[PDB]
Amino acid sequence: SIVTKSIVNADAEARYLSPGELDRIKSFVLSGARRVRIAQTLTENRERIVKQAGDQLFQKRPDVVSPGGNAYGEEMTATCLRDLDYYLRLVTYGIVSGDVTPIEEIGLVGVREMYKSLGTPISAVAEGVKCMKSVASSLLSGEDSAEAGFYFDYVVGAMQ
Amino acid sequence: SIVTKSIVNADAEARYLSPGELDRIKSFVLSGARRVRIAQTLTENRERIVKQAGDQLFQKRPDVVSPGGNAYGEEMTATCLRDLDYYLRLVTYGIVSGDVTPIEEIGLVGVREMYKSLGTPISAVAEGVKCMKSVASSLLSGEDSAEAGFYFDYVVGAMQ
Amino acid sequence: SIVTKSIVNADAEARYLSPGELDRIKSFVLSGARRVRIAQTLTENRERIVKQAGDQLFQKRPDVVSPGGNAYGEEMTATCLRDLDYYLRLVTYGIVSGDVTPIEEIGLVGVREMYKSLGTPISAVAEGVKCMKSVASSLLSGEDSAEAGFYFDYVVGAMQ
Amino acid sequence: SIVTKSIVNADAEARYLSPGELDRIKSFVLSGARRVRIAQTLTENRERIVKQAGDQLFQKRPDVVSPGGNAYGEEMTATCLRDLDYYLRLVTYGIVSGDVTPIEEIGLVGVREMYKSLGTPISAVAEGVKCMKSVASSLLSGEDSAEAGFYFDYVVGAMQ
Amino acid sequence: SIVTKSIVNADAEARYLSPGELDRIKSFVLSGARRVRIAQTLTENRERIVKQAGDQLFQKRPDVVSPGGNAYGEEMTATCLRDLDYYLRLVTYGIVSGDVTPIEEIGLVGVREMYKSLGTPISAVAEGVKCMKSVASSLLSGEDSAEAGFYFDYVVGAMQ
Amino acid sequence: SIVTKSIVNADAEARYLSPGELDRIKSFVLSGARRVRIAQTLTENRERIVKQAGDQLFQKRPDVVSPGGNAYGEEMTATCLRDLDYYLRLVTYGIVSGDVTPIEEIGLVGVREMYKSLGTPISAVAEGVKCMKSVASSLLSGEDSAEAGFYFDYVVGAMQ
Amino acid sequence: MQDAITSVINSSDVQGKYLDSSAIEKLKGYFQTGELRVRAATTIAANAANIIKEAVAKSLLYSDITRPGGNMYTTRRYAACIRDLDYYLRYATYAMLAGDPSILDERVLNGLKETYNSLGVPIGATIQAIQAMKEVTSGLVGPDAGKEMGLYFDYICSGLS
Amino acid sequence: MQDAITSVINSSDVQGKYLDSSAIEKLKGYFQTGELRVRAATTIAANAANIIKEAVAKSLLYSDITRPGGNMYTTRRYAACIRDLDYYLRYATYAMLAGDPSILDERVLNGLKETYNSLGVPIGATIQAIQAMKEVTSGLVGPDAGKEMGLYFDYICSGLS
Amino acid sequence: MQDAITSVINSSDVQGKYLDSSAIEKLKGYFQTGELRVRAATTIAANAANIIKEAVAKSLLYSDITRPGGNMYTTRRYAACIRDLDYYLRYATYAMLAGDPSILDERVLNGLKETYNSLGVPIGATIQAIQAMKEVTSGLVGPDAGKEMGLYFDYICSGLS
Amino acid sequence: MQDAITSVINSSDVQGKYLDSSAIEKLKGYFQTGELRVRAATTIAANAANIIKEAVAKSLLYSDITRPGGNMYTTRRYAACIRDLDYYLRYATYAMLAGDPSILDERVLNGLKETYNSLGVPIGATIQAIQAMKEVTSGLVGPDAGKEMGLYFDYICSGLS
Amino acid sequence: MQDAITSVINSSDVQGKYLDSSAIEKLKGYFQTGELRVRAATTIAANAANIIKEAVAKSLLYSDITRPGGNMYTTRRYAACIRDLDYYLRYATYAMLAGDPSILDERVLNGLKETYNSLGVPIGATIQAIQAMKEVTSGLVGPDAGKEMGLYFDYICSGLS
Amino acid sequence: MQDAITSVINSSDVQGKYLDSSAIEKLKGYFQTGELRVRAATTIAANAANIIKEAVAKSLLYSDITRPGGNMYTTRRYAACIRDLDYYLRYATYAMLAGDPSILDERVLNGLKETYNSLGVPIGATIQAIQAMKEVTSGLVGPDAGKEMGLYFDYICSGLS
Numbered sequence A, B, C, D, E, F: 001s002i003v004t005k006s007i008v009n010a011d012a013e014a015r016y017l018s019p020g021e022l023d024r025i026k027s028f029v030l031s032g033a034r035r036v037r038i039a040q041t042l043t044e045n046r047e048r049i050v051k052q053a054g055d056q057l058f059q060k061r062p063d064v065v066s067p068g069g070n071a072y073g074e075e076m077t078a079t080c081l082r083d084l085d086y087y088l089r090l091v092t093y094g095i096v097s098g099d100v101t102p103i104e105e106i107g108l109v110g111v112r113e114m115y116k117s118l119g120t121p122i123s124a125v126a127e128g129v130k131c132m133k134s135v136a137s138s139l140l141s142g143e144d145s146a147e148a149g150f151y152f153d154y155v156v157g158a159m160q
Numbered sequence G, H, I, J, K, L: 001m002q003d004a005i006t007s008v009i010n011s012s013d014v015q016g017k018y019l020d021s022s023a024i025e026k027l028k029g030y031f032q033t034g035e036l037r038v039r040a041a042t043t044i045a046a047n048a049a050n051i052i053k054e055a056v057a058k059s060l061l062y063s064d065i066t067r068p069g070g071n072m073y074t075t076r077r078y079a080a081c082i083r084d085l086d087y088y089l090r091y092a093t094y095a096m097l098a099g100d101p102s103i104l105d106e107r108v109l110n111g112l113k114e115t116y117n118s119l120g121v122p123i124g125a126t127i128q129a130i131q132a133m134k135e136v137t138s139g140l141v142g143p144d145a146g147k148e149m150g151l152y153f154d155y156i157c158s159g160l161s
């Protein structure tokens, strides 16, 4: 969270928090309800954001659906949409934290080593997350949608 | 400002800004009017915040007013209240910036070397700024007053 | 070459060459003719090693041949086989040098940044070079073939 | 040995061995018999290479044989030829290893501190080893002799 | 002492002492009696050097004697003259040592942190030690007085 | 000199000189006449200290006088006694300086590289300087002799 | 090194669970006490040099510990001791701003009792000095912010005893 | 290294002047365009890898520069060139988020023309590549954010020519 | 850190003995298996990324260890685990090219069981993963090179158990 | 970096000459003024903070240089300026204790006029401040020590002009 | 790390006591033996390379320790052993010049017996070599300087046994 | 920093050309002179300390340069000069083993004439010393290896003049 981040930076410089740092934690705890509602909307439309984005994936990157293809059918294509639910969950976490750090630790540090091991193309996972983004920016209005989207675009961009 | 600070930190890590950093510049430009009003109130009540705080200084630290005393009369006591106007001005600067950096650069880096040269006691300058604080927290309500005060207390605390 | 490499390492330790280093340059200049013949065979069968390996690529990774596909037809598929001729040429260079350094400098440092820019999958370029390998190990006997192959396998392995 | 040396250098760069490094171990294990024969010749003519070189030492550096002299007679001159047998033995070790490292560790690191302690002149030990060299290059033909000699000249040169 | 200091510097450079260093310990042990007499004079006139200097302090810095004042009467003014006896004692120590190191360790490292905690002005402690200096340079002739004074002036100067 | 040495050390710590450092320059300028007399005695007995020590060298290390020998006769033996006059001169320099630094710079840094180039044994130059020492400690009484000797023994000891 | 918000997120993640109502509850509970924490936090920074002067006065001064042969005698040791007091106060404010005591188990109490028994530092006079620092702070941040702050001063004492 | 806000503060300070109405005017003018800047800023981060692929395609590819003996031949030089393109785009976004071109005079154009004439890098093909990067960005951030962004791409070109 | 050749040389040297027929025997025996070692060595480098993908598939995947709360869950821990597998395979190839297991006692197994019981890494699932890596390699280097290679995979297992 | 004693020694050494009567003369002349130098040296260390306060008061204060837009405005620049004054005084005392101006050509004036014209520092107001520092010192060390000291303050001025 | 002079000063300071007659007594007693210490100190520096050659000859040479498989066999180990002898002699001279054995408890014997039992160094042959170094020194510095010197050689032996 | 083999490879690569008969010609020509180079290379390493002693004797010794006030007077400067001679000989052997003079333009002659005119080193007496080093080497490696070696000694001289 940005509380952790402001404590860690002040501790490093062996001080108490600055004015600009106490204002940043205030702006954050008073945005906390906006956050908890964006997250709630995304957790509720879980099944939808994943299935509709996976359906959309197989129509922009069709190469990964069977001839050769890492998602090779009934146990595999299921696992590809699993991984999409793993990043949807890390994105709600990030939004209530005001911080990309729980997405980084759990799913972005070492993401290239792991997917080159399994033989999965990572441009295709980035494209998947870009498709869940759209399906979420539909279910979300004006400023809630600009905010959830900051966190989907970071995840996508750490994947290529 | 916190814009400068967020650019400098991203550049150092050779990246684009984070979600939590773009939210921090948004929270700041939308607080910008609250800032510009707190500053305006303090610039307008300039003569008052300085004279009334100086009058109050000479009643908590009386030792500095004549027997020995660095503020020694008509040219000196005038210069002591001058220095109080120099820190009032650096405090309004800080509030509209959301940042202690223009107070640090202009008046806090090297403040001990300079006052031990002139023979001025710095506990007494810290006490002066603590007195201008009070005279400002009177002229300011509820949350404007908690905010101007974050910046007066930083200046005081870098002085002892 | 391994001459350059032995001079650079002795210079770094500010000395003349060791026994084991003068023996290594001797073993190398007396293998020089074996090298120049392996290279000659590969330069002569240039058109064959490239076209037959490209034909083989499109049969193990078919995904890259048209639906979506980076090699998208008459100007593109031509460019994919071009890139195969660029790495065949860097491999003959390496064999006469006894050194992977001219392959590294010209085509392996920055190969991931460049292919993620163009959108080319690098597993597919590694697979291409693995296919030119086979078509070369056919045209080459017993020990010439074990040697050319050390250099094809290094290039492939720096690509994933 | 050069096997140890190639493993240590690849491990340091956290990799598998290069083409040029696997060729260097191959050139070495196939020279292994040439090595084991040069060593065998030197181990067999042990008594000869030492006594004849010591006899020759006392005729180029005569100063060390009695007036003052570190080799001062029946227990001392015996010990001077002992030390010559110690470096003959470290030289055969080096030749079968393709490496100066067993000569360095056992007899060249700290050789100046030790001889300045005992009062022995080291130019005189270097000259001794230069004399065993000659007596060996006689007993050895064309290329065996160029090779044993790389290792005698390194030992001599680390001694002044 | 300068014995400790000369051993520490030679040990650091892993050597025996220089000519210039053995001459410096000789000059020092033969001055040892001059030292032990200057110290003795100051230890004997202890009560005098402290009370007369404190009486003099309150006449150059009068601000510290009651209105506000850190030395605030019967328990406080007593403690201010205590601290003067603490630095007189560290000064005799220094003179017999030929070294400022026992004054530094016991009373100068951290002297600013400690006095800003208690609220004591340090210019006023420096001024106190400058007053004990005078009362000592009266009781001491020609060269004994130039020497005790090197050590009073160091203490004063590390205090502002 | 020890003036240079005390300035360099204070400058490094960006300060004025310590008590113990101003006492060390005083002890030195008041010993200055003792120094200038020891030097004068050695400069006057120049021809004697060199010829008598060289005559003595050839009787403790006789090996260096002709059979093989670096001092090989009329131009060579002359040059060996020259080098003895070079170190006598650097020793008088050192004594008036209270410092081994003019002996180090002019004749001890690089003394091993230079003598192993010319083929001169350095134990033999150390022994020469040990012989000029004796011839000087005869011409010098009680404490002048203990002092000149600190400087002859340093030179000898930096030579083996 | 976690505050209340990441504490909930990790507990979710080892179960592979999205944030449920129970987790949203704990979360809204921090965000509610949030403005409380920033204000008390400022009040301590502002009164730092001062809480410490008063706490030292009340417990440590004019005692055996400040007289020759005591662990606070010499200027070096007096200054190294109020440095420690600064560390205790700064870190207890951190853990309150965080809502969680793990910065204190991590970067403060991690083998401190061992260091103190080694250098020969009196732990009892330190717990004495922290309990006073506990009284002066609570009588400056007010009651709501003080029940909370006290927890972290108390967490320090129990890790030293 | 100043943004629009500290630019005004310093200009005040060399005169020893408090912030006057004129300074408040310039200040409110940044704070007004502020949300505009954060949004365009995100849109570039999001489309970074992509603006560059399209700009390279349009200007640099299948030319003499990519064929043997050209400054973009070898993988090392192709990767070092889109690295430079990344630097230009990231820093132009910075200067727009800042409202001021001094980060670009400071950390980007500071003696670059000299470095480019030394290593033998073609400045004309780089200005070509930046002008294309200028077109692709403006046709993605929209018109309000694009008049502004273009200024900073243009500031780069004039410092290279 | 010795291979077969220096092992013989040192054993000679603590006895002050020249290389005798017995030592020449052991020496010629390495030089004979030498070309065997360079070839198997290449075959592993060439198939490294691949031996590991297959070994993981066979032992570690779709299990409790990859699901939340397992030591291979999170990308950081999945990548740190196949990194370890890379270390085991690279070092077993080293020790075979060397003829001797001392690089493995030295730079791999030196207090690893202690590190694994500390971080909480399952040793049994690692020995499981190494035994599979043992099967895939032997079925790629062939029988002569495989009796030998297996010794070094086995040496790792016995130092973990 | 030489004092009077090594100056004589080197001049001897480039001629391969032992110390002659002329050299002994110059040498005894330093050793004679030696106690003079240690005393004046102490008197400056003792009055350092003070010479500088008085010199600043006399030349630099209440002027354009201390008011906004002047090179001594801001605390950072006031403190960096009396730091320079400290450097001038400490080094002039060094060169007097040494008997020779080479520490000043070496570690002080080595391209300072260039640095001062770069940062925009007024050299005339600095020579003004040094000449005052020259007056306050001479009126504290006394006449014998003052003819000498002045030489080194003057050596600084001529290297700045 | 204290010599006789600071030993007395600290013992005074933990009591807050000025230097009394008893302390002045101990002090004058060092200053009296002082010229004795500087002279013996020079005589060892002058004869250092030599005390060691003779001590080695008498105890260590032509034995099992110098023959293959002995801890002084190889040049590296012969040179590392007379290095240790140099350390013992240089530090015993230091402690005598100091009047106090604390430099030896501090920078020499601090866990050496542990290091020696680890590397496999024979302590008995080292105490043998130090006792010989004890005999050669005393028969070169003379009797007054030798009762004293011996104490420090003996202090080393008792810390190794 | 290229030898004859990479010189040919790069010249091929800026043209995007495979190795043609002309390139194979130049290549076989190095591989043919190759054993020649390793042997001459050994002969210099073996006689290094010696070529230099003889070259110094012939040109530099008993002259003005070794007497007081000369650039080779003092031990520091005598040792720094035969160090330079070592650098010239070691690097000329490198460039011959390489077949190409670019290591000498790169790591030896790169602005040396400037360094020599700065420190005040006589270039004419150095070219004198290198020409002698040229004569002693050729009269030790024999004629085939000597035409070649001389080229590199000559390349040094022309870069100093």
Ligand SMILES: *[C@@H](C)[C@H]1/C(=C/c2[nH]c(/C=C3N=C(/C=C4\NC(=O)C(CC)=C4C)C(C)=C\3CCC(=O)O)c(CCC(=O)O)c2C)NC(=O)C1C
Pocket (backbone or CB within 6 Å): C064, C069, C070, C071, C072, C076, C077, C079, C080, C081, C083, C084, C086, C087, C106, C107, C118, C120, C121, C124, C125, C128, H060, H061, H062, H063, H066, H067, H072, H073, H074, H075, H078
């Ligand atoms: C089949 C092998 C793969 C494939 C390749 C492919 N490459 C390209 C475009 C380019 N490739 C290069 C490569 C290099 N330039 C170098 O400097 C080196 C080192 C010697 C190499 C290997 C370059 C520069 C280009 C760009 C073209 C140019 O001259 O500027 C493409 C075309 C991309 C496009 O759409 O424009 C393709 C198809 N395609 C695959 O999918 C595979 C498996």
Ligand SMILES: *[C@@H](C)[C@H]1/C(=C/c2[nH]c(/C=C3N=C(/C=C4\NC(=O)C(CC)=C4C)C(C)=C\3CCC(=O)O)c(CCC(=O)O)c2C)NC(=O)C1C
Pocket (backbone or CB within 6 Å): D064, D069, D070, D071, D072, D076, D077, D079, D080, D081, D083, D084, D086, D087, D106, D107, D118, D120, D121, D124, D125, D128, K060, K061, K062, K063, K066, K067, K072, K073, K074, K075, K078
């Ligand atoms: C003629 C070669 C020179 C010579 C030699 C000489 N050596 C010795 C004494 C010793 N030499 C050694 C050497 C080594 N020990 C090792 O560990 C190694 C590495 C394998 C070597 C080379 C040692 C240990 C000794 C000491 C004897 C012992 O077993 O302890 C002497 C005798 C010195 C004495 O006076 O006691 C001599 C004569 N003499 C010369 O002048 C020359 C040219």
